[PDB]
Amino acid sequence: HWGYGKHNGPEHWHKDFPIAKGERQSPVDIDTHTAKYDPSLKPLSVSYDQATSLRILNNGHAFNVEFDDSQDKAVLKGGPLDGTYRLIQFHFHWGSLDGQGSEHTVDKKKYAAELHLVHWNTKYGDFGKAVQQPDGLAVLGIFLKVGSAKPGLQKVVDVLDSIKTKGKSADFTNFDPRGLLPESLDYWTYPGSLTTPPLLECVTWIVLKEPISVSSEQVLKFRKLNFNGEGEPEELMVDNWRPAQPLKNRQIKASFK
Ligand SMILES: CCCCCc1ccc(S(N)(=O)=O)cc1
Ligand SMILES: OC[C@H]1O[C@@H](O)[C@H](O)[C@@H](O)[C@@H]1O
Ligand SMILES: OC[C@H]1O[C@@H](O)[C@H](O)[C@@H](O)[C@@H]1O
Ligand SMILES: OC[C@H]1O[C@H](O)[C@H](O)[C@@H](O)[C@@H]1O
Ligand SMILES: [Zn+2]
């Protein structure tokens, strides 16, 4: 199946998923000089105070922290978005070394990792229906750079030893995703896609300008996860990022002047 190796990685995905060569694929390079302030953007509202985390899963590609999205709790509204988008899960992409790992780039600069908070548009009723719609999803992307530790990440780091291999999960209740945000909500936005198969072109991307800082020790623990299942030869879960894709007929808008 698809992955991030030489023989099954991003350059091969198009054979099974021909939309990989589509017109609104993600991630992209964010050219900060060409990005334009958009006065039609409304204030962005990240409303995570009632979030209910449930579980953390190693899915063989990354780890997902899953939320109870059976009702409106942690949601994203405003900015470029029409209506209410419910948080379903977050996950990260990261590198084998600190100089790469992010999916989006900023003037071609690669960050050590990237956090994706995934939300679906409640007008479509369920995630599977939302991924049949052009405006079905909103992903809030946050860059990670290595410096000081992020206290609100440590609970994630410390559970990873219990989900080392593909298919393992653990209870992960009472986790507050507000502890993963930077101070500023300045952002860039554009229309794109999922960055993994099935690569569906359903996503409004909202990429925060301000990175969060995490410590070297925190990201080193990400890199101890495994792509493989239990009992199989160890393949470290590193470099689980797709490179930047052609911008094509898109513009990146900025929330800030
Ligand atoms: C429709 C099948 C499930 C899709 C799950 C998924 C995949 C990729 C992303 S990402 N990395 O763009 O944020 C988010 C969510
Ligand atoms: O436990 C994590 C978070 O869960 C939410 O449901 C609560 O409303 C928050 O106060 C709490 O920080
Ligand atoms: O025709 C002028 C318009 O061109 C578009 O490509 C830009 O997004 C707008 O900001 C601009 O007003
Ligand atoms: O908040 C996420 C998790 O953090 C820590 O692992 C706690 O021990 C656990 O009870 C909780 O589920
Ligand atoms: Zn992602």
Query: DSSP secondary structure string, 2-28?
Result: --SSTTTSGGGGGGT-GGGGSTT-S--
Encoded tokens for 227: 């792509």
Query: Which of 14, 33, 61, 119 is the catalytic position?
Result: 61
* Helices vs strands, H then E, count in the chain: 3, 15
Of 211, 208, 204, residue with least CA distance to 190: 204
Measured in whole angstroms, how far is the alpha carbon of residue 77 from the centre of its chain?
A: 17
What is the rounded CA–CA span in Å between residue 247 and residue 252?
9
- Determine if residue 93 is labeled as part of a ligand binding site: yes
Q: Which atom of ligand 1 is nearest to the CA of 195?
A: 12
Encoded tokens for 118: 């995934």
- Determine if residue 33 is labeled as part of a ligand binding site: no
Quick check: CB of 196 below 6 Å from ligand 1? yes
Q: Which atom of ligand 3 is nearest to the CA of 253?
A: 8
Q: Which atom of ligand 3 is nearest to the CA of 38?
A: 10
Ligand in closest contact with the CA of 39: 3
**Is there a catalytic annotation at residue 12?**
no
Quick check: CB of 34 below 6 Å from ligand 3? no
Sign of the alpha-carbon dihedral angle for 61, 65, 71, 76: negative
Q: Are 206 and 140 in contact (CB under 8 A)?
A: yes
Residue 15, Cβ density class (10 Å: 0-12 exposed, 13-18 middle, ≥19 buried) = exposed
Ligand 5 centroid – CA 41 distance (Å): 24
Ligand 3 centroid – CA 36 distance (Å): 9
Elucidation technique: X-ray
